[PDB]
Design an enzyme around this catalytic site. Structure first.
Site, mmCIF file in Angstrom:
data_model
loop_
_atom_site.group_PDB
_atom_site.id
_atom_site.type_symbol
_atom_site.label_atom_id
_atom_site.label_comp_id
_atom_site.label_asym_id
_atom_site.label_seq_id
_atom_site.Cartn_x
_atom_site.Cartn_y
_atom_site.Cartn_z
ATOM 1 N N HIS A 156 -7.812 17.029 39.779
ATOM 2 C CA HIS A 156 -6.433 16.589 39.978
ATOM 3 C C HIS A 156 -5.506 17.785 39.873
ATOM 4 C CE1 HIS A 156 -7.584 12.315 38.565
ATOM 5 N NE2 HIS A 156 -7.905 12.564 39.824
ATOM 6 N N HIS A 197 -11.876 15.370 35.668
ATOM 7 C CA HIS A 197 -12.548 14.274 34.991
ATOM 8 C C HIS A 197 -14.013 14.353 35.392
ATOM 9 C CE1 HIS A 197 -8.583 12.365 34.228
ATOM 10 N NE2 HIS A 197 -8.279 12.976 35.358
ATOM 11 N N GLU A 240 -12.885 9.346 39.162
ATOM 12 C CA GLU A 240 -11.977 8.246 38.867
ATOM 13 C C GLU A 240 -11.809 7.371 40.105
ATOM 14 O OE1 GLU A 240 -8.569 10.010 36.743
ATOM 15 O OE2 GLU A 240 -9.652 9.212 34.998
ATOM 16 N N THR A 273 -3.580 8.611 35.488
ATOM 17 C CA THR A 273 -4.785 7.906 35.061
ATOM 18 C C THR A 273 -5.055 8.057 33.572
ATOM 19 O OG1 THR A 273 -6.330 9.692 35.480
ATOM 20 C CG2 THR A 273 -5.829 8.218 37.336
ATOM 21 N N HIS A 281 -8.764 15.894 25.642
ATOM 22 C CA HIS A 281 -9.052 14.857 26.634
ATOM 23 C C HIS A 281 -9.676 15.442 27.896
ATOM 24 C CE1 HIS A 281 -6.567 12.138 24.315
ATOM 25 N NE2 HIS A 281 -5.548 12.972 24.421
ATOM 26 N N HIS A 318 -6.571 19.754 36.314
ATOM 27 C CA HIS A 318 -7.616 19.395 35.365
ATOM 28 C C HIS A 318 -8.664 18.587 36.118
ATOM 29 C CE1 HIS A 318 -4.898 15.942 35.478
ATOM 30 N NE2 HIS A 318 -6.019 15.245 35.403
#
Ligand SMILES: *C[n+]1nc(-c2ccc(F)c(F)c2)c[n+]2c1NCC2
Ligand code: NA
Ligand code: NA
Ligand SMILES: [Zn+2]
EC number: 4.2.1.1
Length: 265
Positions: free
Chosen positions: A124, A101, A111, A203, A69, A99
């Site tokens: 994050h 996104h 996000e 999230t 992911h 990590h």
């Protein structure tokens, strides 16, 4: 077979992405979901908010993992080595992992948004409240987690990110990990610690409503070359059909009964 032919485990495709998550995780439609759009003109300055205290000098990074992911950089969270306190928080929170996104294109990937603007990526740094003893217990509590969110804009390279970029060749596919000891997460921060804060959620599924979000006002600049290499990772495992790991972001969710606060005016 790609996941859409095999299993409806959650992800970021059309057939398993954010619009589907509520079926297996009904809290996806809950009252304090994340991310949100940060409307800069309506966030209220709160003079009772303290400066954020980030204490990462003694941090012990361990491993970088492709979890199908994103990729997580993991830390030893068995002592108060790398802790977040102050700011809006009334406790001590240990760093467990960070990590990112990111998007398929520079114009998307974050996000949180700021006045509807998207950044190319969002970092994050996930921390859990030590009064609950372990991460798993912390995610059963409304004050269990504190996540420090940092926007990535595309421009000049971020030197403290390059070690992350350089190792990605060795964790291309789901389930691969590599040693990532001796990494200093202080090199991922911007200069200013001014922030917005609000109560929200993870999230990603299970979308648990445990998070005090602390989103830094100042983005970090990263180069196009840094973020484009993130996009060469794979969601799939080795030997499975290749699906580039891109667009692993959840869009902004309804603010509902929340007012974002600002540490700065
Ligand atoms: C790649 N793959 N695909 C399938 C798949 C079987 C019928 C995929 F009608 C499909 F769309 C019908 C089965 N598996 C794999 N890999 C492991 C097993
Ligand atoms: Na030490
Ligand atoms: Na508070
Ligand atoms: Zn995240």
């Amino acid at each position: 077979g790609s996941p859409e032919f095999m299993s409806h485990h959650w992800g970021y495709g059309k057939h398993n992405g954010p619009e589907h998550w509520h079926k297996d995780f009904p809290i996806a439609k809950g009252e304090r979901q994340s991310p949100v759009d940060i409307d800069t003109h309506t966030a209220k300055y709160d003079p009772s908010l303290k400066p954020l205290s980030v204490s990462y000098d003694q941090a012990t990074s361990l491993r970088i993992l492709n979890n199908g992911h994103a990729f997580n950089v993991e830390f030893d969270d068995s002592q108060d080595k790398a802790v977040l306190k102050g700011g809006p928080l009334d406790g001590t929170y240990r760093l467990i992992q960070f990590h990112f996104h990111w998007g398929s294109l520079d114009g998307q990937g974050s996000e949180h948004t700021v006045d509807k603007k998207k950044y190319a990526a969002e970092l994050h740094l996930v921390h859990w409240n030590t009064k609950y003893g372990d991460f798993g217990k912390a995610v059963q509590q409304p004050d269990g987690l504190a996540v420090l969110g940092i926007f990535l804009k595309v421009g000049s390279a971020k030197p403290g990110l390059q070690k992350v970029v350089d190792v990605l060749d060795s964790i291309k596919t789901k389930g691969k990990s590599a040693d990532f000891t001796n990494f200093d997460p202080r090199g991922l921060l911007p200069e200013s610690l001014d922030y917005w804060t609000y109560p929200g959620s993870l999230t990603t599924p299970p979308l648990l409503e445990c998070v005090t979000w602390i989103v830094l006002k100042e983005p970090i600049s990263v180069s196009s070359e840094q973020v484009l290499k993130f996009r060469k990772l794979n969601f799939n495992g080795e030997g499975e059909p290749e699906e580039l790991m891109v667009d692993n972001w959840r869009p902004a969710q309804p603010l509902k009964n929340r007012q974002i606060k600002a540490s700065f005016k």
